[PDB]
């Protein structure tokens, strides 16, 4: 069967109206815990959630310029911990050049290729980039 070209409908929403894409969070209806998509709440084990759209802007908590990376991935590439105001940390690749990012730098959501799939086609996912 053909491999995925988009990661992932459960974590990333691309509005039907053509509006700006956003990361999706889920709030447990029983305990009120906010987390990324799960079958059951890690805190109370409830299976009832409400989708909460997350901020498109975050801060680079930390990052690393990768010269020897994952097998098959073109190098150099950058990845980071991006902290969102909703008190949720997202791991994501950063768009741009090596030796240009800093800790606590403001970033914005963007869509781009994260890796080649099993059919050697790019998988489109969320990334973060410097704000213009």
Partner 1 sequence: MKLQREVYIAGVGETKFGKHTVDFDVLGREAALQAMNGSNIDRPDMIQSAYVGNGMNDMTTGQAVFRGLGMCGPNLPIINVQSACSAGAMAVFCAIKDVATGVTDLSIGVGTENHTMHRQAARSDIETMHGAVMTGKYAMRATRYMHETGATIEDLAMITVKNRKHATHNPYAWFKGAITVEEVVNSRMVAYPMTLQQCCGIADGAAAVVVGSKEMMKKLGIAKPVKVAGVVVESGPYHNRPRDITGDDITETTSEKLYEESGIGPKEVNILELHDAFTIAELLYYECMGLCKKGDGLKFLRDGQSTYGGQCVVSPRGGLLSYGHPIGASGAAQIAQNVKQLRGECGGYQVGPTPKVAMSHVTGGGLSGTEHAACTMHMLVKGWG
Identify which of residues 25 and 132 has a Cβ nearer to partner 1 in the complex. Answer: 25
Site for partner 1 in 103-132 (CB under 8 A): 103-104, 114-115, 123, 125
Identify which of residues 56 and 116 has a Cβ nearer to partner 1 in the complex. Answer: 116
With CB under 8 A as the contact rule, the residue among 66, 111, 116, 124 that binds partner 1 is: 66
Task: Compute the CA torsion angle 13, 39, 31, 126 (nearest 10 deg).
Answer: -30
31 among annotated binding-site residues: yes
- Verify binding: residue 22, partner 1, rule CB under 8 A: no
Lookup: tokens for 27: 């709030």
| 8 A C-beta contact, residue 3 and residue 121 | yes
- Per DSSP, the three-state class of 112 is strand
| 8 A C-beta contact, residue 130 and residue 96 | yes
Cis peptide before 8 (omega within 30 of 0): yes
Applying CB under 8 A, the span of 12-20, 49-57, 75-83 interacting with partner 1 comes to 75-83
Looking at the DSSP assignment, which residues form a beta bridge with residue 22? Answer: 13
Lookup: tokens for 45: 């084990």
103 among annotated binding-site residues: no
Task: Note the residues at the interface with partner 1 (CB under 8 A).
Answer: 7, 11, 35-36, 38-45, 61-70, 73, 77, 79-81, 83, 87-93, 98-99, 102-104, 114-115, 123, 125
Residues of the binding site for Zn(2+): 28, 31, 41, 44
């Amino acid at each position: 069967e053909p491999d995925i070209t988009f990661f992932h409908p459960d974590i990333l929403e691309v509005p039907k109206d053509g509006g700006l894409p956003y990361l999706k969070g889920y709030r447990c209806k029983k305990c009120g815990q906010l987390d990324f998509k799960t079958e059951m709440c890690t805190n109370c084990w409830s299976e009832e959630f409400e989708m909460v759209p997350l901020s498109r802007r975050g801060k680079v908590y930390s990052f690393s310029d990768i010269y020897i990376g994952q097998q098959g991935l073109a190098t150099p590439y950058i990845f980071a911990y991006v902290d969102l105001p909703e008190n949720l940390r997202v791991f994501a690749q950063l768009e741009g050049e090596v030796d240009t990012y800093r800790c606590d730098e403001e970033v914005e959501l963007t869509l781009g290729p994260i890796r080649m799939n099993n059919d050697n086609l790019p998988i489109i996912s969320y990334k973060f980039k410097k704000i213009a």
